[PDB]
């Protein structure tokens, strides 16, 4: 239970510094793509999630060693839920825009609006923020208390949105694979399909399971003692692995 938290400390700091200077590079320094707006918004969501996990790790370290007992304001975990859901939503949007780049090539070249990327980022963050702030009112993370069932039904709405994001990313990825296998000849397709397989594997077994254990397991599995010591630290360890691994695949590998 402890060395999971030390492991997420290491992963969260290395992801924090890597995603941070990605967020500086294509935030201010380097000329950007319309795709790089998506990578920027994913970096912002991922930066928020990683720093909030660093703060919660410091809370556990302080309350295990110095015993300061900082009752941290639970206003912020609404923003954390927004950052996590926005990160997965932007990852699905990256996969969808790649699918639209290959399926409709001349449209993506010529007739794609340049501020369509900005309005997808803004509207998607607004959807994630509205969803998370409604969960914060309806559950009681925020200053207002909330009932139990009306928490759990819109929390199942969040989980249904998450599994819909997985279906959108899977459908976009498989459409991209079949379009490459039926009509591509100038492409380095081996590196291509290993990259798409790697990112769907990351979104399956590194990015989903914290949302799975936090958004549907607590109202379905329900033993309240076995899963807490084992599943819940390791799950956010895997999502911290997703968080650290996003800048390499999305931005870093291409740049270098």
């Amino acid at each position: 239970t402890l060395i999971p938290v030390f492991l997420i400390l290491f992963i969260a700091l290395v992801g924090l510094v890597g995603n941070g200077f990605v967020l500086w590079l294509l935030g201010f320094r380097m000329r950007r793509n319309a795709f790089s707006v998506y990578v920027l918004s994913l970096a912002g969501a991922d930066f928020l999630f990683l720093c909030f996990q660093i703060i919660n790790c410091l809370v556990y370290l302080s309350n295990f060693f110095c015993s300061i007992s900082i009752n941290f304001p639970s206003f912020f975990t609404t923003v954390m839920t927004c950052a996590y859901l926005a990160g997965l939503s932007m990852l699905s949007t990256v996969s969808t825009e790649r699918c639209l780049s290959v399926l409709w090539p001349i449209w993506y070249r010529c007739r794609r609006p340049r501020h369509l990327s900005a309005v997808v980022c803004v509207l998607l963050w607004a959807l994630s923020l509205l969803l998370s702030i409604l969960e914060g009112k309806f559950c009681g993370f925020l200053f207002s208390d909330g009932d139990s069932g009306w928490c759990q039904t819109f929390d199942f709405i969040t989980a249904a949105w998450l599994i819909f994001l997985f279906m959108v990313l899977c459908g976009s990825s498989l459409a991209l694979l079949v379009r490459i296998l039926c009509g591509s000849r100038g492409l380095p397709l081996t590196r291509l399909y290993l990259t798409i397989l790697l990112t769907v594997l990351v979104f399956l077994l590194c990015g989903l399971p914290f949302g799975i254990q936090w958004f549907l397991i607590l109202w379905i599995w329900k033993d309240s003692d076995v899963l807490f010591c084992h599943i819940h630290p390791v799950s956010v360890v895997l999502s911290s692995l997703n968080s650290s691994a996003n800048p390499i695949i999305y931005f870093f590998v291409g740049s270098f």
Binding site: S74, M80, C139, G140, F141, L218
Partner: peptide, 5 residues
């Protein structure tokens, strides 16, 4: 509290 994160 949903789960006291």
């Amino acid at each position: 509290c949903k789960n006291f994160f």
